[PDB]
């Protein structure tokens, strides 16, 4: 029974837990309600715009977005198309920790893939056709 604010905040929290499928699928289901959608995308917008030490907000928000564009509301797709700039800037996201370790690498990878997916509307439609 968790609120949508708490669910989306926990899913994208700054910690090393990756969002659970349980959580991604509940988000996806909730994305079909216009009020929940507002809440989910509000938080994801904030977190995708984070930088530097808060890279985990980005990485996780990207995972959520990647799941929503396949399993959530068609509005999740339209949102990414409307805010495509945010996603595209993430293909070059950098954060080197003070040990000289690139944490951005996986974000780049995912952002490159999601931009690719978004631009290949026929492939995206095929995937979306398999959702329940």
- To which residue do tokens 């056709």 refer? 129
Domain CATH number, residue 79: 1.25.40.90
| Domain with 106 in it | 1-132
Alpha helices in the chain (DSSP H): 4-11, 21-30, 34-48, 55-71, 74-82, 84-90, 105-119, 121-129
Radius of gyration of the chain from its Cα atoms, rounded to whole angstroms: 14
Distances from the Cα of 123 to the Cα of 28, 29, 70, angstroms: 19, 22, 10
Taking the C-alpha atoms of residue 55 and residue 34, their distance in angstroms, rounded to an integer, is 28
Taking the C-alpha atoms of residue 61 and residue 58, their distance in angstroms, rounded to an integer, is 5
Number of other CB atoms surrounding residue 92 within 10 Å: 11
Exposed / middle / buried, residue 83 (Cβ in 10 Å: 0-12, 13-18, 19+): middle
Q: At what angle do helices 55-71 and 74-82 cross, to 10 degrees?
A: 130
The total domain count for the chain is 1
Taking the C-alpha atoms of residue 114 and residue 91, their distance in angstroms, rounded to an integer, is 9
């Amino acid at each position: 029974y968790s609120s949508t604010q708490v669910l989306v905040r926990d899913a994208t929290a700054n910690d090393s837990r990756t969002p659970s499928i349980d959580t991604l699928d509940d988000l996806a289901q909730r994305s079909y309600d216009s009020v929940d959608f507002f809440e989910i995308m509000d938080m994801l917008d904030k977190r995708l715009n984070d930088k530097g030490k808060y890279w985990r907000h980005v990485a996780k928000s990207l995972t959520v977005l990647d799941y929503l564009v396949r399993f959530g509301s068609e509005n999740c797709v339209l949102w990414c198309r409307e805010n495509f700039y945010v996603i595209k800037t993430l293909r070059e996201f950098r954060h080197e920790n003070e040990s000289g370790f690139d944490e951005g690498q996986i974000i780049r990878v995912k952002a490159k893939e999601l931009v690719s997916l978004l631009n290949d509307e026929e492939r995206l439609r095929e995937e979306r056709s398999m959702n329940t």
